[PDB]
Structure formats: structure tokens, C-alpha cells
């Protein structure tokens, strides 16, 4: 097992995921069976707790893992499927080492991070070398590491020499110091700045690791001079002196690296053979990336929501519009509404970005309503939902979304303005959302639904199932806890509300189709998950079509 | 709440709980309400856990706590009660947090060592700052914290960080900082060496720590110009370059400490006021004092055992012993003799150790078969323990000690030479010792027994009952497994093994007196833990008495 | 060249230069060109201005370098010639480097300690490298170099990069790291503490150094356990857990080394071959300690002086009376009488010493008053010289000591009672002792007389020249300013203190022999600096012959 460790200093955010799912899609394309193992530094443990605007997504494993969305980017990059097993945080280590020894397992002596913790570490580091992560179920090739954290984070610093002494017990070409750090520049000066690289590197040096490569996050290409001088200052190969600029999209990425011939260093440092026709795929990416480069019309799309408010919450959900993006070769606009501003407040607080949310709803080609946390904006999540209902506009709702527009549907429709979801208001006449938890055994209380679950189509005569490849049944990432009341479903069957998906019970309902709707589908389960380049998930790829209008030509063509 | 914390570097052992026991008396002399906490950075939970040998004793506190000894310094030093929640483990803390994490406290979000650990840390301070721990129930005045680990010890630093801010929570004045450091001298050149202190210390105010009272641990006192240096690479005066040369006995520290008047410095820099006589008690130490350096004979004891190989294993033990030398106002040599040195397997390997400890084990005055762990040396023991009987000496067994002593005393009288102990034969003709714990509701499998118990006499006519003063029952502490078995016990009734102590529920033996016997008595529970100078506990009193051939005319003379 | 750097952690004095000095010997034994280099951090520079005091002798160079005494011990150890290029201070690279940025050498731009300095170091280590210090002009094979501080201290961190990068210029097998560390050991437990190694090597390889071998200063022996978990701790081989407990005598230590096989590792290390017969000599060291195990009466000697407070201030100077107790093969007691003590002051403060010291004093079979600074004792130092010449005591001046003796004489036999030193006493009746500075060109002032200069006989008829073998001159170190006024000399040449040494020019006097005295002489050179075990200068041998009272035997025996 090639162990290559990424590191990275000075700043959160560096891009270490970036380079190593960009490496790993290499390394798979050298031919390797790739696997990989994302250390968080996280005292907590459970990714799924935390809150999705303070970081993200949490990407859901096949086998329920709770976890950070870097592991489905590595799954968008390499087919490879991650479990827990793949992400670990100090938190489990805790417990883990602790009921050790409660075990007495370490003879009821204390337990030091040196040796205890560190050997652990180690142990841990082989528990998932040893673990295929392919339908070969044969021990990988290569394992890249994903150390979470900074350079001087105490939080790190058990890794650090569970490593440094690792390395050794490993042999030299069987480990590899990936090192990622920061060339800034300011504005007001345009120097890049390599100094803070150097501190980095020299705390590195210090603790006892010393890069193999040094990935340098630049904006814009580095000079010579520059290279030539953290050659020096680092005492390192201006080959390893890698200056990776800020890219327009991150699949320009192994492009560069492929420039930069990073890999035939690795064959060179890890002292590994490659057969290879142009060294790497190359048509794959190069293919992209000419379709990238050439792309008509802009679609735009408006994401209503909370934690709308721009972050990266939504970024595995943009990257699943930019497959279908790709698919159709159009471009993208991905607008930004805080369906707070859609609300009479705003309009009494701030009109002109009440007005211009509205104006940008309407100007927008789709709408997506997608799930989220919080009574905040549901009036206006409910507006807008009821507006695309009414305008015929493509809407998409997710979890939340596709709840909230049933409840429209009521309110506007069966005239149950009180319609409410329990979610928010306990006193309601017609309770549409219901909690409605699982009950597993050994369970205390419910649980949320999550996890790769099957969905039955209860209908051949479904534009998703049509999208789908008229499958008998689909299976998705889940991801909720509050479900259609049934009592009032019985009331929405003689209506036009048609529920298509549904559980394996036949009870928890997946997916809604309005008929007589250009399109007007909500899903609780969450596609943008599996969604690929190669293989987009059909309700964003079906948006985008309603979105264009083009999509009855697409099933006219043949689907 | 004044909070002394007392910090170390260089090399445990230095005698951090030494100086902080010593402070404490003094404190309590002074006239607060002193209580403590003592941390220790380990990462198990349990010193109960942790060897004997190791370590030492683990002394158990009235909750049943299985703590670390020094806290049972401090309660010979202070007649304060201490509870499990004077002593915090890392391990601890890890599994509190863990579960305010799963309890979702921290909204599901990473908890860090900084805010939140360091905060919960300083909640726990307050947590015990808030227990007195006196028949006085207010707060306690001032709070001693022993910090364990050294200054440089990862397994302190949230800590550190902790303290550094909390001392600006707090005042000034309510906080005050002992570092312990070290002054070695080599032999070789004889010059005392300040640089490792002033490592310590500029590491400590590279921390953010600085020093109210520097602790010295010297060899002989410092000279001049030592403690000028000292002054002056601190930054300190040098009254508070504290010399604590090292003392034939620990009794002379606090006498020390009056002499360097470091009372007077608190005083000024807590802002104390004090009502005084001789500043502080003086009478108390002071006569000790007179009374340890004025003391006739040397009676020498012979500690039989495994662990006996000389460690510290037993200081609480020989400090039991030195509170019964100070009563009668003799000398008092322990010898070691490792049990197994009584054995024909030493005979075989080196007979000079075989007959020296025989030897040894004859001009010794009283034996004592402690507890203990592990097969090894047990027929040594055992052979020691028929010796001891039929040579009419002193003995004491404990635990284990008297377990054998029933099992020898079988052997050889009852004539059931295979009688043993199933703890290390489970093919025993006569289970003599036989597991017998205690099943608690709520717990899986049986636990030894521990704590403070009651346990009751099964006669007046007892020659430990008439030590203690005729008392129907006594309390003490409790820390063991095997038990007589009753079904031979029936066979030892009629003979002159005559079992005095019972449990409450008359089951479980405690305490047997061998009948026609000048002193030969063992007990299961543990009363080292529980005598005092003052009050010492009579079961090595009476020993010491037996020793010296005194203990008939005692308790003729009046008890 | 092989770079073997000796590092050392936790205080000095740990014996840095005696292992240097021990394993330089043993290199030259394998039959290596070993030359070696002491780096001391040292701001100052020219050891010639430090206190004999404050650490003690300042070796003087064939070169006349004023350098520290490890140096001589290095050619007390090796033949090897050391110059001033040996001996390097930061002081030294100040001023040097400083000149070269006014000469515009780095183009007026800002040095750094990186690269420039540490460029400068290694540039130095080469300077140095490339001398020879054989009469073989040939590049050393192998260079030691003791780099002084320990580990931690600012000092000493630009040489910790320097040579951290150094060692990857040159190959692995090229340089050695050796680490000196402490193993202390309270009295107080008798435990042998690991954790200050622990610190001081986790720091080091925090640096990025990692010892090769490690030098444990133990007191007694390690045991296995200790060994093994300093292995674990350091992950070194208890081979390289290198344990040179304490020895009596610095002798044995290389014999210790020996018996530890450190050579082999060296061997194998630096892959060296070796042509051998015993490993190494070995019948030089062994049978130098059969000899020191088989000494037959103790002479002592009275040293008398200043500085004579034990210290080892004349660690060089009872070494070479040892060297003599070794030819003679007796025993040798240094007694240390503060000349302070001989005076009357004494006797009016405390008379217990007074006459204590002049008991001892008489007691001693010989005399020895050295050379030192300062006017105090001089009253002391004078009165034992007119004791010693009235009871015909052998007697030995040196330098002050001789100067003294020649006033002392004038005093009480030429009745110049107020004859005197115009070092101490400008107002002098009789200028005994007198400023005489060399005046060379180029020099501001006068200078002290220093280096190896050459004395003159001025007769045949001289004991030291008999000593010496009947040599015409001799060549001997020199370090002295005030010389004897020729004035007074002329009045005592009719006298029977005959000066028997002068310099070339006839001018200054170097030796003085008092006669019909059975050994009364004074020098002003500096003879324990080339004295050797081999070879034994011949005052201190001839001093111990008379205080032995052989001497007249040893000359008429053939000398
Ligand atoms: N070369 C690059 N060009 C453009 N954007 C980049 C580049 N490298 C990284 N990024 C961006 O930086 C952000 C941070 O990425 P990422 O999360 O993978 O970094 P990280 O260092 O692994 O920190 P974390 O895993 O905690 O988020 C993303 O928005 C990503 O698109
Ligand atoms: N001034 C002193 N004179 C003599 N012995 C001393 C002195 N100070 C401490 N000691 C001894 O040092 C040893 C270590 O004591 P102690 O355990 O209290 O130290 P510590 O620094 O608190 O480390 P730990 O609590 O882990 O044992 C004991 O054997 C004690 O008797
Ligand atoms: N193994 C040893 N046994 C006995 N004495 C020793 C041993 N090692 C060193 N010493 C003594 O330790 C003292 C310090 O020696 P030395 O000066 O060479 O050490 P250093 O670490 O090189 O510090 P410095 O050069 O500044 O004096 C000397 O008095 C020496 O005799
Ligand atoms: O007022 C000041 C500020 C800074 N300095 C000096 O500036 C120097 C830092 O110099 P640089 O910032 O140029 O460092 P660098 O060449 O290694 O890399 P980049 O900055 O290009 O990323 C340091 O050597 C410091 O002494 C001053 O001397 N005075
Ligand atoms: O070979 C050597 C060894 C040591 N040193 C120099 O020795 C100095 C350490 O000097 P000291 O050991 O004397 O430190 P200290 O006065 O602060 O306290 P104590 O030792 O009495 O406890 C440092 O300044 C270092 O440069 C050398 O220059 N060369
Ligand atoms: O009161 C205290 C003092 C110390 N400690 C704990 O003591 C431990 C230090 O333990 P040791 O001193 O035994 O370290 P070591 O085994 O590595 O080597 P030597 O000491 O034999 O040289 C640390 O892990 C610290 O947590 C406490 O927990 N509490």
C-alpha cells in the first residue's frame, strides 16, 4: 500500500480534497486500485449533526455513513465506494480507545497518546488500507489520506507523529508527504507572498515531515524567481515546486497536474510501473474540458431557499445541474434567492430586494425548492412554490420542498388554508406533514429515514420513471423524517396531486407528480448525491429540459 | 474561591502533592476552608485499574472513589472528606463531552480543546469549587489543584490554556501559581543547576503561566548567589525562590515553607487576613517534630511479598507503621523480603538470597503479609506465614495475607495439605478461597468488593475489638474479591481459628484471631487508608506492640 | 570526511567532551586522521578573557589560541595539533560575516540566518575540515565536532540547521549524530528517570535531528526495563541506548565504549573498515587502568590560592600531578586550602579554619601555589612560601605563585620587608614584581606574554634542566604579564636564588630554583598544559619525587 498523506497549512479551505480527488481519478486512471481515508480532526463524531450552512453537505454513504461531502466528491471522481470505515474522527477514537479500556485491554495501566493513541492511529490506518474499495476486493494499491486540519492545529498533532514514525515502518517508497499550502497576493501589491508557505513548511520540517511534493495554491501562475526561491527556501525541486493557479473549474485541475507531469514523479518517488497511450485519460478530461470551454444559452435557476444565502451548502446540488449543464451543453445561472425576500416583511422592510427577488423569480428559466431547516421563509418558500404552480413554471421541490408544496396544494386547492406540517405548528387543522420516524429496534425513540432505500413506482405512467428507463423500481439517498399524512393523501388521490413514489411499505411517499404541469415534481430523497457527469440524475437533467423546453422533444426523440 | 494551582516541570515525582499537602495544612492551620482537586492529565478513568506496583496504592475514598493516594495525603494532612469528584481524568472528560455531543448540547456542531473543552474544564473547577468538603458545608475558602504531567506535556496543555484564561476569570488576587521545579546536583561536581528550572519556567511564561512562588526541590539548600541567579533569570524575588532541600521526612516541609514565611507572601499576594498566635501551628509539628527527632530501639518489620521489591508500593503502609513508631516512640526498620527469596526455588538459584532472607525474616520482630497480586512467591508466603505461627511472631496478614493464612492454617493443622486457593487453583480439593463478589442490580457479572463498610463483631471476647474500644462494630476500607468458604469454615469452628469480623450480612469474614498465639490476626479490609498520627489504626499498633513484647502490659495497663 | 556531531540536552557539564575526547581516541586507535571542531555558541569571543573561575583553565594553543581546556584534553587524548581555526564562537561569525556585508560580499542586501549564516557554519565546518592536525598533511578522515549548548537553547539553533540540511549535502554514512543526554536519579527514590531524555530527544527530532547513537549519563548502570523503554520511546535500538554510567576515573570510559561495541556500530554506521588485533588498544588503556586499580602511600599536596575553592579550575593541573602519581604509581590527595584561610583575618573571624588550614598545610607532603588573579589570599599565599622555604617543604610557584616567592624571599632575607608587587601596590619601596607587557607592532599598549615560547637555560648546573634530560632550551606555554625587576635580580645574583630560565632575549625570567633547598622553584610558563600521561612535565613530577623524598634517589638512580 502507497501511503500518500496530504497535508496542507495556513488556511482551511486550501483545496487539499481538490488536489487529492484530482490525484486519485490519476492514479485510477494509471490504473491503481485507489482507495483513500479522510482524517477529521473533529472531536465530535458524526458529520450528519452538523449543520449544512456551516459547512456542507453531509454526504450519505451506501451504508448510511454520515459524512463529509470530500468523500462523495471522491466518488464522483472515482467509482470506488467509500464506507465509515473511510472517515474517522478523534471523537470515535475516544470512545473507541476508552471502552478499550474499560476492557482493561491495556491492563488497566493509563494509555498515553505516545505510544497508545499513536498505534492506534496506525492500527486504523491499516483496519481501512486492508479494505477494498472496488468490486476487485483486493487490498488497494494506494491509499490518500486526507489529514483534515493545519499545520499546528493541536487537534492534528497525535497524527503528525503517528505519522512521522508510520512513514518509517512503512518503507520510503511506500509513503508519500503530500503537502498543500498558500501563495497569496494581495491586491494592493500583486506580490505572491511565499512566506507564509515557508512558515508552513519549516513547522513541518520541525515536526518531523518533509514534503515530497509542496502543492502551492497560487491565483495566478508563480514566476520562476518565485519557484526558484521556495526551491531554496524549502531545499526542494522546483519539479516539486508545484504551482497549481486558481482554475475556472476544478476538472481543469488534473489537466494541470498532468502539465506539471506530477505523476511521473510518483512513478519516479513510489517507484511504480505504468503502462500507458497518452499517459492518462486523456480524451476523458480533455473531452470535458473542450465541451467546458465549449458550451448556448444560459439557463438560469432560482434557488429559493434559507442557507440559500450563498454558501457552498448547495454545491454538490449545483455540481448536479452542471452534469445536466454539460449533458445539453448550456450554460448555467445559478440565482440566489433568500426566500425571506419574497415575503411581505421584506417588502415592509426593504422593498427593493422584496421586488428584485420577485423580479429575479420571474426571471429565472426554473425554480428549485430544495429541503432545508427552519420555519424561516416558509411563507416564502410556499409563495414561490404556488407562484411556479400557477405561472407553470418547472418546479422542483426536495424534502422540504416537496412537503411545503403539498401543503400549497391543499391550501390553494382543497381551500385548507390551515393547512400546515407539524414540523412548525403543533395546532393543525390538517396535519399534511406528519412526523413519522422509523422505529428500529435498539433504537430509543425514532430515527431520521437515511440511507440508500428502495422506492417503488407505483405507476408505469410517470415522466420520472420514463426518465428513469422505466424501471420498476429506483434506489436513492434518503435523507428525512416527516412524511405525508395519510389521511389527507386519501383526499389528494381523486385530486391531481398524483403520488408516484413510495416506499417498500407502501407507506412513506417519494415522489409527487402534478399532472397537468409542464413540470411540477418533489422528491424526498436525494438524487444529487448519485448523480455523475457520465450518468446526471434524471429530476435536475428533466429541469433543465422543462427549464429550456425541450424536454417533450427529449422523450419525443426517445428519451 | 483563591486558586492555588500547583504546577511542575521537569520530572514527576518532584513532589508537587508533597509541597500541596503541606500548603494545605498550613492553609487550614491558617483557618479557610481548604479543599483540592487533583488533575490528572491521564487518559484512563479509574486509578483502580492501575498497578500497585506501578503506581501504589490506590487509595479508596468514602464514595468508594479508587483514586490516587495523595488525595489520602491530603486527608492525613486535612480532615477534609474528598469524593470521586476531586479527582478528573482525561478520559473522563472525554466520555462527559462525548456525551453532550451525542446529546447534541453542542448543536450537533465539532466541539474544539478551545472554547469548549477548556471552558468545560473551567467548569469542572467550579463544579468542585463548589463542594465543601468539611462538616462545614460552604464553600471552601481556597482550592490547592494538584495539576499532574509537567510543563511540555501534551496531556496538559488544554489545561494551560484552561488556567491561562481562567486566572483572568477570577482575580488576581484569587489565583495564585506554584510552579515546582528542580535543582539536581550531580555528584560528580557537586554544583547545583538552575538552567533545567529556568527551562521550566520560560517555558511555562512562553505559555502564558507565571509563577507566584517558585518551588525549589534542592538537595542541600541553595546558596546565595544561586538563588541571585535564580532571582534574575526569573525575574522573581528571591523570597520567592523557594529552596525545599530535600528533608529526612516529609513532616519537616512544612516547618520549612514557616521558615521561609511563604505564608506571610500569600497573605500579601491572596489578600488574606490572618488571626494569629505563633503564625501557625506551632505545637502541632513542632512537638512531632521534637518527637522524630527524639526517638528507643529499632523495631524491624518484615514485609513479606511480591511487590515488596522496594517501591513505594507500600508508603501508606509503612506511614501507618510510623504513625504506631510515633506513638510508642520507637524506631522502626522495613525490611523487604521479596517472598519468593523464601522459597527452595531460590534456594536452587541462589542460596545466599535463600538463607539471607530467612535470616532476615528471624531477626525481624513482626511480619506482615500484606494483599497482593499474581501466584508468585505464594508459597513463600505461606511457608513465612507457618513460620511466623509456629514461632509465635507477630503477624499481620491483609487480604490476601490472611486468605493464606487460612489456607496454611488448614494445610497444616486440618491435615488438608491440598487445600487452596481457587483464585490460583481451580482444581482445589478444599476450595479454602473461593470468588465470592458482590452482585449489584445494574451490573454485569460480580465486582469486589470496595468502599467503607461496616463490619461487625461476632464476639467481645476479641482482642482487636478491645483495640478499637470495645466497639459493636467498626467501619473501614474495603477492596477485595475471595471469601472464606463457609463449608469449611463449619470445620474451622471447632478449631482455635476463631473468625471474629463478619460483613453486616454475617457472611463475608473480615477479621480471624488464631486463638493461643501472642499475636498472629488477619484482616480483608484495609485500615491503612484510615489511621492517622493522631489516631493510628490498631491492627499495627498492636502489631508494633506484639513486636516489641509491650501489648500485654498495654492492655493490662489499660488499652 | 565524516561528520560525527555531538550534541547533548538537558545541562551541561554532562560530559559532552570527555565522550568526544573518548571516542576521538578510540577513531585514532582504528587508525582515522581524526580531527575535531568545539562550537561554542558563545556570543564572546577569545576564551583568554573568561574567568579561571568561572570555567577554569583557558587552554593555550601551539597558535597561542586562548580556548577552552576541552581542547587540551582532546590533545591530551590525540597527538593532534589544534589551532585557533578549531574553535569557533558566534562572536567570531558575527564580526566575520558583519565584515563581509561591509565589504558588499552579499551585495549590500540583508543576510539572513538562513541561508546566510548557515551557509557560513557549513563553510566553516569545510574550512576546518580541510586542515590537517597530523603531521600527515592529509585531510581528516573523520571529524567530531562538539557543538556546545544544549538542545533548546537560542544559541544554538542556527548550527541546528546548519547542520540539519549539512547532513544531506553530505552522504548519510557521512555524518553521525550523537546525543548525550541525562538519566538522573533522585536519592530520594533511586528511580532513573527516562522522561528528561524523552524531552530533550523528541525536541531535537522536533528540530529534525535524530541521534544516531545516544550517550545516556547514567549514574549507576540502566537495567534492561529502563533500556528497553528508552528504545521504545526513542524507537532506537538499545544498542543505541548507549549507557555510560558514572566512573571514578574518565579512563575507563573509553573502555566502557568498548565494552558497549559503539565502534562496531560506527563500523557498520559509517561504513568504515578496520584492520585490527584487539579491537582497539588496547593494552594502553588496560593497562593504564590495571595501574590505576593497582596504586601505594597518598601524597598530598597543598594547593594554595584563590580560585582554590573547589572548582575545576585546575582540573589540568592535578590531571598532570596525576600523571605523575602514575609514573610513581602512588596515590594523590589534592587538598584545597583557601590562602584566606592562613591568614590572620581567619584567625580573628574563625580561627577553627585558621588553624585547620595551616594543620593541613603541614600535614601536606608538598606545596603548590599556582598562579591567579586578584590581590586577596596574597598574605595567605606568602606565608605558606616562607613556611614552605623554612621547613624546606618542596615547594612549587607558579607564575603569581613564583612571583610571590621571589618577594617573599627579598622580604625576609634581604629585610625588604617592603619589597612588593606593583600589580598590587604601585607605591612599592621595592619594585619587586613589575609590569612588563610585550610592545609588538601593530599592537595598542602592551600584551600578555602567551603562546608556546622558548626559555633559555642559563646554566648547566639546574635540577629542571637535569629534569628535562640536559636540553639547551625548552619549549613551553606561556600566559604572564609582570615580570622580575632586574633592578633587584642584581641584588640577588650574589644570593642563593638563582634564576636559572630566561627568554630569548635574556630579559624576562622564567625559571627560579632557590638553592640548598631540598626543592624550592618557581616557574612563570605553564607546563601542565603539555604535560602528558606518557609524557610528565617534569616540575610536577620532580615536586612529587620531593615530596615523596625519592627525588635524590630517582637522579642518582640515573634519572
Ligand atoms: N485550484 C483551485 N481552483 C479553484 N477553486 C479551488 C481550487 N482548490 C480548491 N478550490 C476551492 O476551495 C474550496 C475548498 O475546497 P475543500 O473543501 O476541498 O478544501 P479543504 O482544504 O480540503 O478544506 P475542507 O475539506 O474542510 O472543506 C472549494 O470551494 C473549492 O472549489
Ligand atoms: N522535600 C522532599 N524531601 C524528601 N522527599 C520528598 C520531598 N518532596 C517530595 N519527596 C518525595 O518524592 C516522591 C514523589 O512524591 P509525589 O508523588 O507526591 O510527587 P508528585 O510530583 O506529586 O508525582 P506523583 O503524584 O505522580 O507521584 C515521594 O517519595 C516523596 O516522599
Ligand atoms: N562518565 C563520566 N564519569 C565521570 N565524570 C564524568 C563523566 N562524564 C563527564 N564527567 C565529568 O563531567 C564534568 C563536565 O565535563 P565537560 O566539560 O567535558 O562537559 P561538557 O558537556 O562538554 O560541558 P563544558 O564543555 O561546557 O564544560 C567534568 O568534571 C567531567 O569529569
Ligand atoms: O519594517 C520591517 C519589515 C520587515 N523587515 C524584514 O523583512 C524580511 C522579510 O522579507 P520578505 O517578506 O521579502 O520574505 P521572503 O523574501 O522570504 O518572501 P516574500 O516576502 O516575498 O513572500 C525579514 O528579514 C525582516 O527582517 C524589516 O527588516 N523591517
Ligand atoms: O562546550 C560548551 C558547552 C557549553 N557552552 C555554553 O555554556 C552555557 C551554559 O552555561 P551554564 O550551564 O553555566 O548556565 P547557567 O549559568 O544559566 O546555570 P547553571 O549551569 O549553573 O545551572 C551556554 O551559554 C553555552 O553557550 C559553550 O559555549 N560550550
Ligand atoms: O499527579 C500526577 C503526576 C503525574 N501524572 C502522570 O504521570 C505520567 C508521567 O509518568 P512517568 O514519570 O513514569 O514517565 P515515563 O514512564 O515515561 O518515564 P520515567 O518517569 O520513569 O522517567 C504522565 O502521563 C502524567 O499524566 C499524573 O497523571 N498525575
Not at 185 to 196: D, I, L, R
Not at 383 to 409: D, H, S, T
Not at 462 to 475: I, N, Q, T, W
Amino acid at each position: 500500500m502507497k501511503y500518500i498523506l496530504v497535508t496542507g497549512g495556513v488556511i482551511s479551505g486550501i483545496g487539499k480534497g481538490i488536489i487529492a480527488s484530482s490525484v486519485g481519478t490519476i492514479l485510477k486512471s494509471c490504473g491503481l486500485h485507489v482507495t483513500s481515508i479522510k482524517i477529521d480532526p473533529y472531536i465530535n463524531i458524526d458529520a450528519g449533526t452538523f449543520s449544512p450552512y456551516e459547512h456542507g453537505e453531509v454526504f450519505v454513504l451506501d451504508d448510511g455513513g454520515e459524512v463529509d461531502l470530500d468523500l462523495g466528491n471522491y466518488e464522483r471522481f472515482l467509482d470506488i465506494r467509500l464506507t465509515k470505515d473511510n472517515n474517522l474522527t478523534t471523537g470515535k477514537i475516544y470512545q473507541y480507545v476508552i471502552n478499550k479500556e474499560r476492557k482493561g485491554d491495556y491492563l488497566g495501566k493509563t494509555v498515553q497518546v505516545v505510544p497508545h493513541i499513536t498505534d492506534a492511529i496506525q492500527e486504523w490506518v491499516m483496519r481501512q488500507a486492508l479494505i477494498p474499495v472496488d468490486e476487485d476486493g483486493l487490498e488497494p494499491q494506494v491509499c490518500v489520506i486526507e489529514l483534515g486540519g493545519t499545520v499546528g492545529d493541536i487537534e492534528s498533532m497525535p497524527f503528525i507523529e503517528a505519522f512521522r514514525q508510520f512513514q518509517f515502518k512503512v518503507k520510503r517508497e511506500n509513503f508519500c508527504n503530500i503537502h498543500v499550502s498558500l501563495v497569496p497576493q494581495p491586491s494592493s501589491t500583486g506580490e505572491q507572498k511565499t512566506k507564509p508557505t515557508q512558515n508552513s513548511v519549516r513547522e513541518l520540517r520541525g515536526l518531523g515531515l518533509s514534503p515530497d511534493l509542496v502543492v502551492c495554491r497560487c491565483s495566478n501562475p508563480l514566476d520562476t524567481s518565485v519557484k526558484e526561491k521556495i526551491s531554496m527556501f524549502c531545499h526542494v525541486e522546483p519539479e516539486q515546486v508545484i504551482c497549481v493557479h486558481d482554475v475556472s473549474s476544478i476538472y481543469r485541475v488534473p489537466l494541470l497536474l498532468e502539465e506539471q507531469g506530477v505523476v511521473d514523479y510518483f512513478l519516479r518517488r513510489l517507484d511504480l510501473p505504468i503502462e500507458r497511450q497518452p499517459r492518462k485519460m486523456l480524451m476523458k478530461w480533455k473531452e470535458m474540458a473542450d465541451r467546458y470551454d465549449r458550451l448556448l444559452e444560459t439557463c438560469s435557476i432560482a434557488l429559493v431557499g434559507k442557507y440559500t444565502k450563498f454558501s457552498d451548502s448547495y454545491a454538490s446540488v449545483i455540481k448536479a445541474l452542471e452534469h445536466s449543464a454539460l449533458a445539453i451543453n448550456h450554460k448555467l445561472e445559478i440565482k440566489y434567492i433568500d426566500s425571506a425576500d419574497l415575503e411581505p416583511i421584506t417588502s415592509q422592510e426593504e422593498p427593493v430586494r422584496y421586488h428584485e427577488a420577485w423580479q429575479k423569480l420571474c426571471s429565472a428559466h426554473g425554480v428549485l425548492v430544495p429541503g432545508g431547516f427552519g420555519v424561516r421563509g416558509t411563507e416564502g418558500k410556499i409563495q414561490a412554490i404556488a407562484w411556479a404552480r400557477n405561472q407553470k413554471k418547472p418546479f422542483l421541490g426536495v424534502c422540504l420542498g416537496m412537503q411545503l408544496a403539498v401543503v400549497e396544494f391543499s391550501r390553494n386547492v382543497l381551500g385548507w388554508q390551515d393547512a400546515n406540517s407539524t414540523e412548525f405548528d403543533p395546532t393543525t387543522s390538517h396535519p399534511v406533514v406528519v412526523d413519522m420516524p422509523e422505529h428500529n429496534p435498539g433504537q430509543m425513540g425514532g430515527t431520521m429515514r437515511l440511507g440508500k432505500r428502495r422506492t417503488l413506482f407505483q405507476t408505469k405512467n410517470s415522466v420520472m420513471r420514463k426518465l428513469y428507463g422505466d424501471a420498476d423500481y429506483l434506489e436513492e439517498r434518503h435523507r428525512h423524517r416527516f412524511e405525508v399524512n395519510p389521511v389527507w393523501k386519501k383526499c389528494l388521490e381523486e385530486q391531481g396531486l398524483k403520488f408516484v413514489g413510495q416506499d417498500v411499505e407502501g407507506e412513506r411517499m417519494e415522489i409527487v407528480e402534478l399532472e397537468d404541469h409542464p413540470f411540477f415534481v418533489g422528491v424526498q430523497y436525494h438524487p444529487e448525491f448519485l448523480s455523475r457527469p457520465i450518468k446526471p440524475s434524471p429530476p435536475y437533467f428533466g429541469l433543465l429540459l422543462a427549464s429550456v423546453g425541450r424536454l417533450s422533444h427529449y422523450l419525443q426523440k426517445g428519451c
